[PDB]
Amino acid sequence: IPMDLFDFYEQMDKDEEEEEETQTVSFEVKQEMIEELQKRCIHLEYPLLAEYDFRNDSVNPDINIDLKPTAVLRPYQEKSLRKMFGNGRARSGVIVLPCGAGKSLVGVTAACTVRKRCLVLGNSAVSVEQWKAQFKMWSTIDDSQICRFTSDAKDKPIGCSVAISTYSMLGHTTKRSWEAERVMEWLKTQEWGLMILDEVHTIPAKMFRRVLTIVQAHCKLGLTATLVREDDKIVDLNFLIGPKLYEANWMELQNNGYIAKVQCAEVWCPMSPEFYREYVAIKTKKRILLYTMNPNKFRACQFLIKFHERRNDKIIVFADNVFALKEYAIRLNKPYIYGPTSQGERMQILQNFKHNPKINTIFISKVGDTSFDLPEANVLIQISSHGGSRRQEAQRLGRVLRAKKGMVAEEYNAFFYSLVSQDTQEMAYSTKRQRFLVDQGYSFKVITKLAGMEEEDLAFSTKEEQQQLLQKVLA
Amino acid sequence: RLGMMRHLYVVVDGSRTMEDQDLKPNRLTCTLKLLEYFVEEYFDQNPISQIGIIVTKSKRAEKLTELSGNPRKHITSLKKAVDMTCHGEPSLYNSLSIAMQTLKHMPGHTSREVLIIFSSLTTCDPSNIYDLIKTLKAAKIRVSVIGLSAEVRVCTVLARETGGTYHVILDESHYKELLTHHVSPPPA
Amino acid sequence: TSGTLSPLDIYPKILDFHPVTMATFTMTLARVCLCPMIIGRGNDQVAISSKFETREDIAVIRNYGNLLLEMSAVVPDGIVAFFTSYQYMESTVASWYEQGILENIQRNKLLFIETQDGAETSVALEKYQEACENGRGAILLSVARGKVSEGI
């Protein structure tokens, strides 16, 4: 019976003396006792099923957060917190929802419900500042106990939620990675007990994974929309944070005056003289440019901007590369936003795009993703298949697009487009993209021709024009 | 069946409440569609007879068909009405006064009848409706109401005082049973 | 007697005596009656704490004012809304005559306030029986203690 049972720590492992012979592990591996990774503590179901239990004799009895107030979440979010009360730590650990519908609120509520000494992990200071703005109803004495805790200073019991910090490892002041042995876990090194991760996909990377791996970490919750990069690490995240409690929030459940119905499309474009000579012959990182700048595909992108500006729709055009961004945008004479565009000029372009009926198309680089209060529109065009994550295409779509007036309860009232050059490595991403979006509940189709592109003025009207671009791209 | 001749004024509720999806597609669509089925069955049972069609909508009365002995006008009018739908609130007093004016003219041995399909709860008319009910019973104009989910007392008294036919309809099957009871002739 | 009294105990409690008991009518099925309760329908419906129901504006505005309007507009029949006091009644229905500009029901209902008059009471019952939602016993507000309890 476990009334005497010691349990300890060695470098990243838990060893269990004079044992109760617990299920699901090897025995006398190198001594009479059981020995697991720290990170295996998460598997509380394997003892719970057996009817086994354990005690935290290493406890520290100091004080904790109360945060008694409540707020109202979306109908699926409220169902998702209600499930978490239901399931408990044996059968909980991540939630997936867009970066534009209430993820900050799920984190402050997840900490106010769970109610333990908490450390909040985030990607960015702006997101700490959005959390703070969310959290003001549960903030103790409004503004006299909230503080930041990162590379310049630390103070107070709370802040953006409870104490927030960043994932970073540049040196001794880049907080969570550097501090990962001092404070954090109620059962051993026992100052705190609860972990809330915003942007949770960020942690399972090869160096970062160690922050999570080198503890027992009692309670853990993660929140994300991108969830994984193109190589799919996500089997690891079940171990590292916990299993996935939720994924859906389909626009099928929020149509009539609520968000958008999006017609999704992929566009297959043919390939014009000289560009495949050179695509086929070049194996280097330049070849990404011959498939993206393919003038038949540029003419589809131009024709599509013209159709939706003729109807006065608002359009964001995404370009994965600053070269591509500027070659498309300067030719189409639409503003662009990227890293080196300043805050003053970005806020002028974005205010113009949202409120000026003359400024209806803009071009944007990777800086939106994971973070850029991206503005509202009704049309999204991606010039390329990229290598950022099929799941980030759906986060980006979801956070940017809304219903056009009048038509707020129809089958579709917003539009997404991804442009693909036929007979290239750009095509490989489609059978995955297509399966992903339809599994996310989206109506998605393939457009393979445009015989009305043969009825109007567009660029690249000759071989000589196309040759002028081909020489510039090759250089 | 032959023995006497009937005059019947079909009155339909074209208020905003008739748009509702409670009774197939919506009440307006289900009622006009079954009412077309009734006209042909009543005229087949009653070869020497007449009907006229009135609606109450947007706080007024309108004549969809004039009083006549050819069924074709009435099914063509029920077809033409569905497109223009229903909005607003009844005008029952003005509809019983135009119906009265046509029915008073008719000779001694023919019936005087008003059939009303009712999905409202009152009517917009200022005029004193009780004076007009007293006048219907003197004139021998009989008024029947088929109501949708509704027993509001002035309508029920108005159908009882004029002859005894306030009925409630809760399905498309029950409404076809009610119209088919009205297809049935009077004694002579 | 009092119509119903089946749990029996309160009368012997009040008497400090133990009468002979008897149930002396044949009753009808439960299905002719329906006795609902209302409190909310999603997990975000938190405005009904009623720690100070006489002061909780958000709670009066939310399902107390809003559920009444949903139920009355959907269920279009003659329906009387009973309140615990005049002050609640006045706050819940903005009416023609509002206690503030900030009150949360907009729909044709009739009032039943103090200085009720025996002749004036009948006018409101004539209106409710005749037609429309509104009248005495119809879409009208009355405090449950008040005279409307005599009925017609």
Side-chain angles (χ1 to χ4, degrees):
Chain A
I1 315 297
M3 98 293 161
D4 189 48
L5 190 52
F6 206 79
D7 77 298
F8 217 58
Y9 171 53
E10 196 166 56
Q11 299 161 17
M12 189 169 64
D13 280 313
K14 182 261 288 186
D15 73 80
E16 208 155 282
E17 178 181 299
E18 203 194 317
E19 78 276 67
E20 198 64 40
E21 295 194 27
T22 309
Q23 293 166 12
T24 68
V25 281
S26 296
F27 294 171
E28 226 203 68
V29 175
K30 85 196 207 289
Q31 188 182 4
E32 269 283 24
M33 58 167 51
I34 48 168
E35 304 173 294
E36 66 184 24
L37 288 173
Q38 293 186 296
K39 189 191 59 175
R40 201 177 183 279
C41 184
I42 199 167
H43 298 157
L44 288 180
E45 90 179 101
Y46 294 156
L48 183 59
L49 183 49
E51 205 157 83
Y52 272 59
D53 204 357
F54 197 61
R55 187 178 175 266
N56 188 11
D57 185 60
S58 319
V59 71
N60 202 294
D62 193 30
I63 72 169
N64 190 17
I65 69 194
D66 179 75
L67 311 176
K68 183 52 58 191
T70 58
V72 193
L73 295 100
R74 293 296 199 161
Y76 68 87
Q77 279 166 359
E78 293 177 350
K79 191 142 173 273
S80 305
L81 260 288
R82 165 189 307 130
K83 191 177 181 185
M84 187 156 141
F85 183 87
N87 274 41
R89 205 302 85 100
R91 279 178 202 112
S92 318
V94 160
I95 294 178
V96 183
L97 82 163
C99 299
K103 177 145 70 66
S104 61
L105 184 68
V106 164
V108 299
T109 51
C112 304
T113 65
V114 183
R115 188 190 308 151
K116 296 196 191 297
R117 297 182 283 273
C118 179
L119 46 146
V120 188
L121 291 81
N123 96 325
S124 168
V126 155
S127 296
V128 321
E129 291 292 322
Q130 293 175 317
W131 279 56
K132 202 184 62 197
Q134 190 68 270
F135 182 83
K136 182 160 192 191
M137 167 71 71
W138 299 261
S139 182
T140 312
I141 186 46
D142 190 86
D143 208 2
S144 279
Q145 273 180 30
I146 47 177
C147 269
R148 181 182 283 192
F149 192 126
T150 188
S151 55
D152 72 324
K154 55 190 181 79
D155 197 16
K156 312 199 191 188
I158 58 178
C160 303
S161 177
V162 198
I164 191 155
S165 290
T166 310
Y167 293 113
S168 53
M169 194 36 166
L170 184 57
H172 61 244
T173 50
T174 40
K175 188 57 64 197
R176 261 274 74 66
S177 296
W178 178 91
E179 194 172 69
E181 307 179 73
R182 187 193 69 72
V183 51
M184 63 234 263
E185 167 50 5
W186 98 296
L187 179 63
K188 308 286 177 294
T189 317
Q190 60 268 61
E191 195 155 319
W192 296 346
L194 161 65
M195 317 191 169
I196 300 306
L197 295 84
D198 193 25
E199 302 307 357
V200 74
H201 56 293
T202 311
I203 212 68
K206 175 174 183 171
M207 302 308 272
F208 299 92
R209 178 182 289 198
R210 187 167 74 92
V211 173
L212 275 285
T213 307
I214 204 165
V215 242
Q216 309 203 264
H218 183 242
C219 282
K220 302 188 269 197
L221 185 69
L223 305 177
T224 185
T226 294
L227 190 44
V228 276
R229 279 182 169 194
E230 198 67 64
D231 81 303
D232 304 277
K233 295 171 188 61
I234 180 64
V235 166
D236 226 72
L237 206 74
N238 166 319
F239 228 118
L240 212 60
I241 308 322
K244 179 186 86 194
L245 195 79
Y246 189 96
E247 173 175 2
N249 66 239
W250 310 324
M251 293 179 161
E252 287 292 285
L253 273 74
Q254 316 91 53
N255 175 263
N256 175 46
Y258 288 103
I259 204 169
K261 279 247 200 180
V262 183
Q263 174 69 103
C264 299
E266 195 166 276
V267 195
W268 295 350
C269 308
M271 273 309 235
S272 50
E274 321 112 59
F275 280 69
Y276 178 95
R277 191 173 70 225
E278 307 301 332
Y279 176 72
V280 175
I282 296 171
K283 306 307 193 204
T284 78
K285 180 176 169 69
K286 184 186 290 294
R287 86 196 309 222
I288 292 160
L289 198 72
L290 288 170
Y291 69 64
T292 302
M293 296 307 295
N294 164 25
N296 314 283
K297 173 181 168 176
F298 194 100
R299 281 180 64 91
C301 193
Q302 191 173 11
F303 169 70
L304 284 168
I305 290 145
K306 291 170 75 208
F307 187 91
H308 278 290
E309 292 180 332
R310 186 175 290 187
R311 281 174 183 64
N312 206 267
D313 271 273
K314 299 290 197 184
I315 302 145
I316 301 183
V317 190
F318 177 57
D320 203 55
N321 184 341
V322 185
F323 198 113
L325 175 111
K326 286 184 195 199
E327 291 303 288
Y328 263 81
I330 294 175
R331 281 181 194 74
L332 296 184
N333 192 39
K334 310 312 171 179
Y336 52 78
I337 279 175
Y338 70 134
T341 301
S342 64
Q343 284 192 334
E345 182 170 60
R346 289 183 216 209
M347 210 287 202
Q348 196 169 280
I349 297 151
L350 286 163
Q351 192 164 276
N352 267 265
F353 187 58
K354 282 169 297 187
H355 303 119
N356 194 352
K358 286 177 61 180
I359 312 279
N360 273 53
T361 312
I362 67 173
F363 278 76
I364 322 170
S365 83
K366 300 172 191 170
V367 299
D369 252 326
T370 324
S371 191
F372 164 32
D373 47 302
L374 273 169
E376 170 182 298
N378 317 96
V379 186
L380 182 45
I381 299 159
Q382 319 190 122
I383 72 167
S384 54
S385 288
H386 62 76
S389 174
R390 313 311 88 203
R391 275 171 180 270
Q392 192 167 100
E393 300 202 282
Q395 165 190 302
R396 175 158 59 239
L397 183 158
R399 61 191 315 222
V400 155
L401 311 173
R402 297 296 173 250
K404 194 169 196 177
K405 291 253 192 323
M407 316 92 175
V408 301
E410 303 294 298
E411 314 275 94
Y412 50 90
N413 46 35
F415 285 84
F416 168 83
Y417 303 94
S418 289
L419 272 59
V420 180
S421 274
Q422 286 176 261
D423 296 81
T424 65
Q425 77 185 108
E426 200 181 50
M427 290 202 76
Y429 293 97
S430 299
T431 293
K432 207 188 166 178
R433 189 195 254 138
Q434 186 296 322
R435 285 162 174 169
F436 171 54
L437 269 285
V438 304
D439 193 276
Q440 297 290 292
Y442 289 80
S443 289
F444 188 93
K445 63 174 37 178
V446 177
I447 313 163
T448 56
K449 50 172 183 175
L450 282 173
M453 207 176 72
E454 297 291 293
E455 312 174 89
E456 49 179 91
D457 170 74
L458 288 170
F460 301 105
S461 76
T462 55
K463 306 310 299 164
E464 289 77 27
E465 284 162 314
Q466 284 166 42
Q467 190 68 37
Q468 183 180 249
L469 179 55
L470 199 71
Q471 178 156 324
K472 193 178 180 193
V473 169
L474 276 177
Chain B
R1 185 166 186 185
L2 284 186
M4 58 82 64
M5 182 170 64
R6 303 179 67 181
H7 291 266
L8 167 70
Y9 254 79
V10 183
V11 173
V12 56
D13 186 5
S15 310
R16 195 72 180 263
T17 46
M18 211 60 151
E19 201 172 57
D20 184 29
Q21 54 165 69
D22 197 53
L23 176 59
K24 278 9 266 186
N26 49 79
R27 304 156 159 158
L28 193 273
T29 302
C30 179
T31 53
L32 296 188
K33 178 170 186 166
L34 270 61
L35 273 166
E36 288 173 59
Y37 307 160
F38 156 83
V39 168
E40 291 206 80
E41 286 305 327
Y42 159 113
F43 260 113
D44 187 71
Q45 185 56 257
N46 314 284
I48 309 299
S49 56
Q50 284 76 199
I51 287 181
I53 311 174
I54 281 176
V55 56
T56 61
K57 171 172 178 190
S58 297
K59 302 187 172 176
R60 295 311 183 172
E62 185 178 90
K63 298 181 299 190
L64 299 189
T65 323
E66 85 190 322
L67 186 292
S68 34
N70 186 278
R72 202 106 61 154
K73 297 186 64 82
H74 311 92
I75 56 179
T76 292
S77 297
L78 295 167
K79 271 270 165 304
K80 191 165 183 158
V82 83
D83 185 68
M84 66 77 161
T85 79
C86 44
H87 170 48
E89 287 169 286
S91 204
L92 297 186
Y93 183 103
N94 183 236
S95 305
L96 302 160
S97 297
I98 282 169
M100 171 156 65
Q101 190 171 319
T102 322
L103 267 47
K104 283 167 64 182
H105 282 324
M106 305 302 179
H109 193 254
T110 73
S111 58
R112 297 199 168 145
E113 297 187 78
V114 179
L115 180 59
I116 291 155
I117 310 77
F118 173 86
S119 190
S120 283
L121 32 88
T122 190
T123 182
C124 287
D125 313 94
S127 304
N128 181 14
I129 190 56
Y130 282 74
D131 186 76
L132 179 143
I133 300 173
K134 280 192 290 252
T135 294
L136 292 178
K137 190 181 187 193
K140 295 172 160 175
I141 300 180
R142 268 173 72 87
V143 188
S144 301
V145 185
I146 294 174
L148 295 67
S149 326
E151 211 208 295
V152 310
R153 203 194 170 195
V154 65
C155 303
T156 310
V157 166
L158 178 151
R160 282 172 180 187
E161 191 51 33
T162 56
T165 30
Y166 197 89
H167 304 135
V168 75
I169 171 290
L170 73 106
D171 201 66
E172 175 180 309
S173 68
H174 200 173
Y175 190 56
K176 193 167 307 194
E177 214 64 53
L178 285 189
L179 285 191
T180 52
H181 171 94
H182 279 294
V183 170
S184 303
Chain C
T1 189
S2 47
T4 51
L5 36 56
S6 60
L8 288 167
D9 169 68
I10 188 58
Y11 283 111
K13 190 159 279 163
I14 292 156
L15 276 169
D16 206 18
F17 188 79
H18 288 106
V20 190
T21 49
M22 184 188 180
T24 199
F25 85 116
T26 306
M27 180 54 182
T28 195
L29 62 178
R31 187 274 305 131
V32 289
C33 90
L34 190 59
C35 314
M37 55 177 173
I38 51 180
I39 190 176
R41 275 178 290 171
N43 65 308
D44 66 308
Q45 299 189 27
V46 306
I48 203 159
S49 269
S50 302
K51 189 79 179 279
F52 321 90
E53 73 209 83
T54 47
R55 191 181 78 212
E56 283 185 13
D57 77 299
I58 310 182
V60 173
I61 290 184
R62 302 277 185 251
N63 276 301
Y64 262 95
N66 189 11
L67 213 296
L68 165 42
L69 195 274
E70 190 196 316
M71 197 177 254
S72 52
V74 304
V75 184
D77 241 303
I79 295 167
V80 57
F82 282 104
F83 275 85
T84 65
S85 85
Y86 290 128
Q87 302 90 267
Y88 217 114
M89 144 168 173
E90 291 180 88
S91 177
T92 41
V93 181
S95 195
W96 57 59
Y97 190 54
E98 77 291 287
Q99 57 161 41
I101 63 193
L102 200 52
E103 299 303 339
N104 198 59
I105 296 173
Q106 287 66 32
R107 214 63 174 209
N108 188 1
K109 318 204 167 294
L110 201 59
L111 75 172
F112 209 69
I113 204 74
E114 68 180 77
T115 316
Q116 308 158 98
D117 205 276
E120 288 186 280
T121 291
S122 301
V123 181
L125 173 279
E126 275 182 44
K127 288 184 173 159
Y128 147 63
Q129 67 78 54
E130 186 167 288
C132 210
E133 313 139 291
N134 72 93
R136 185 195 75 154
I139 279 279
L140 156 139
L141 264 65
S142 50
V143 169
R145 289 298 326 148
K147 281 180 186 284
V148 183
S149 70
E150 193 180 80
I152 181 59

